[PDB]
Amino acid sequence: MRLAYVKNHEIYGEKLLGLTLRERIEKTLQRAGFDVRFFDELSLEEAEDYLIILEPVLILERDLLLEGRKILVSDGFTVGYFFGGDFRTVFDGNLQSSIEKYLSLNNLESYEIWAIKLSNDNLKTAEKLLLSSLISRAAFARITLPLARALLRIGLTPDAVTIIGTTASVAGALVLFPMGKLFPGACVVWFFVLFDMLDGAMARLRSGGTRFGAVLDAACDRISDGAVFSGLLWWIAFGMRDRLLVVATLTCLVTSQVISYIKARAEASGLRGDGGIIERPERLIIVLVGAGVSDFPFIAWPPALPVAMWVLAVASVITLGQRLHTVWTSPGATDRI
Amino acid sequence: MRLAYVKNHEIYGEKLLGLTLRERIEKTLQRAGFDVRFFDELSLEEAEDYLIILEPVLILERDLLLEGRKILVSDGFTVGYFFGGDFRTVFDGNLQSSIEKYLSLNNLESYEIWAIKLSNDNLKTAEKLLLSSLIAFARITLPLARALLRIGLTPDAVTIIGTTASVAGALVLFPMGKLFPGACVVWFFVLFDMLDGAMARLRSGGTRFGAVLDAACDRISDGAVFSGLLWWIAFGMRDRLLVVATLTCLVTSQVISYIKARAEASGLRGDGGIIERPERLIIVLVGAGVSDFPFIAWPPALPVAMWVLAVASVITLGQRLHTVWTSPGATDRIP
Ligand SMILES: CCCCCCCCCCCCCC(=O)OC[C@H](COP(=O)([O-])O)OC(=O)CCCCCCCCCCCCC
Ligand SMILES: CCCCCCCC/C=C/CCCCCCCC(=O)OC[C@H](O)CO
Ligand SMILES: CCCCCCCC/C=C\CCCCCCCC(=O)OC[C@H](O)CO
Ligand code: NA
Ligand code: NA
Ligand code: NA
Ligand code: NA
Ligand code: NA
Ligand code: NA
Ligand code: NA
Secondary structure (H helix, E strand, O other): OOOEEEEEEEHHHHHEOEEEEEHHHHHHHHHHHOEEEEEEOOOOOOOOOOEEOOOOOOEEEOOOOOOOOOOEOOOOOOOOEEEEEOOHHOOOOOOHHHHHHHHHHHEEEEEEOEEEHHHHHHHHHHHHHHHHHHOHHHHHHHHHHHHHHHHHHHHOOOOHHHHHHHHHHHHHHHHOOOOOHHEEEHHHHHHHHHHHHOHHHHHHHOOOHHHHHHHHHHHHHHHHHHHHHHHHHHHHHHHOOOHHHHHHHHHHHHHHHHHOOOOOOHHHHOOOOOOOOOOOOHHHHHHHHHHHOOOOOOOOOHHHHHHHHHHHHHHHHHHHHHHHHHHHHOOOOOEEE | OOOEEOOOOOOHHHOOOOEHHHHHHHHHHHOOOEEEEEEOOOOOOOOOEEEEEEEOOOOOOOOOOOOEEEEEEOOOEEEEEEOOOOHHHHHHOOOOHHHHHHHHHHOOOOEEEOOEEEEOOOOOHHHHHHHHHOOOHHHHHHHHHHHHHHHOOOHHHHHHHHHHHHHHHHHHOOOOOHHHHHHHHHHHHHHHHHHHHHHHOOOOOHHHHHHHHHHHHHHHHHHHHHHHHHHHHHHHOHHHHHHHHHHHHHHHHHHOOOOOOOOHOOOOOOOOOOOOOHHHHHHHHHHHHHOOOOOOOOOOOOHHHHHHHHHHHHHHHHHHHHHHHHHOOOOEEEO
């Protein structure tokens, strides 16, 4: 049903980390559900999908999801094409002319794949990238990049997007949470936290960000977390009138601020301060899911808000210790000044 | 290589200002480029220079430069000997006679250094002289630091103790409405946490970890102060507008410090602002204390201090950000 036509190249005969690039790309495409056909002159068997790979490439993605009609790209180089079966009606023997005709007749999008075009002079980089791949950031890039392109094209800048997302998140948190609309507040806050995350991709498309932009993005993270926790606290203290839960919420707020501060300050002194069980994404998911479940339409479970807040509280205290341990074990930490 | 042979003594195990005299003289001589070897009977390893210290001594000089053949002295007392490697050819097992022979065979000059020969009955004077060497503040802060070091405390321990005591004061006294005693306790133990700097100066000089810990504990103390105040304001006073002002103060106090830390982590500046941590603490603590002052408390001091602080904090939040924006290299593109 799915055929992957790979053009034979000289470098696919080279070995890399025990296996040849030929078998490597073959198994990679087979994992993606493709039947692999190497070729020198293209003969289009009847299929529903065609993945045609013309340049020699090492694919660095484990899970490859291809749909629609796309041009696969990698660092600006056009790796291959993902066409429908209808391309057989346009393929007239001359591959370049058929490809150009098909691109003129159809709507195609670009598909940024984590891969590297193989040449005689970059195989060491291919080895390094394969090791990096073996340890989804690639799927994150493949989703964020078109949105970043669109936002840049309508005149937005990465820092502007940071401020927009942070302002919308604080507005949602401080408006919807105090009046008890925990589920729509959780949705709005999550949407605009994801929105604020786009500034990095936008700066990558501008061939570079700035240090001020990074500092602004992080300080805005702190502002947004403070606002989420403050709006939840307002609801818990004055809506629910729950003193124990206020204790948990104040603990969550202060500890999340200090957890981020430890990493920042350790790096300011030239040390490490990262780590911990609960970082910002897990922290936001636990509190927002707890708030959303507590106000879910029709079948809300109100105890989800306290359970999330208490678990996070303990999970934050522990993290605060863990990061301190990181600072304590960083080289030069106990060095005398 | 140059070897410093120090004769072992019981008194080198005594601690002065947190560190032992053995470790103190060891680090001092290592700063001078010597490999330090403690001994009771001398075995001369091969070296280019020999620094022989026989009496127990505290060296009070930071920069010691030894080049020729010399006799180190201090106020008439012979501190040590600086001989060449050729002393290995004259050492016959008995150190005093070999030293006298080497002195008879060579011409040496007396190098007057700043040191003190240690005895059991002058350790207090030696500690006072060491304190003079390492550095009101002098009458109150330094003796308190010396006392805290003497009972085995270290700077990081005092940081944690002072922060824990201030957090306890804030979280016990403020929520039940005891704003004046809470302000007193918090101020006292913030000063206590500040004693960590003097203790580090008296010891090695402090660590990067210590600096990071002191600052993170500052953040914890500020969070606890504002949280106890918020508890009282929300459930004791039932004043919601003042609660928004207090939440603004809390969040902004965390974020203001985070900006500076994060900018410095990026190699930029982030300090400044109209209201810094000492001013913030003075404002909120004075407002709470005046609001709960004994006999004739003035209730409006708490809200005025908070709202000012809120307005003063938000502005500060911008200023530091502007500082980051104007730091050299801030807006440079990173390829
Ligand atoms: C500084 C931001 C303040 C602007 C807040 C905007 C809220 C608009 C009102 C939205 C509808 C909420 C209705 C409601 O039930 O609560 C009203 C409440 C104020 O009313 P009152 O009870 O104080 O009279 O409303 C509130 O109390 C809002 C609670 C949020 C207060 C916490 C502010 C913390 C700021 C976070 C960091 C700031 C960035 C520098
Ligand atoms: C610009 C700001 C202008 C503000 C103008 C004043 C507004 C009204 C003041 C209310 C404070 C509450 C008054 C009564 C509560 C006293 C607060 C307090 O500290 O109480 C301690 C004591 O334990 C309690 O019994
Ligand atoms: C580390 C920073 C995060 C820690 C955050 C912890 C905040 C909660 C701590 C103590 C509250 C103690 C409550 C003491 C009793 C309440 C007094 C009260 O307000 O009672 C009002 C009364 O019911 C009608 O006027
Ligand atoms: Na951002
Ligand atoms: Na920027
Ligand atoms: Na951000
Ligand atoms: Na209650
Ligand atoms: Na301290
Ligand atoms: Na230290
Ligand atoms: Na401190």
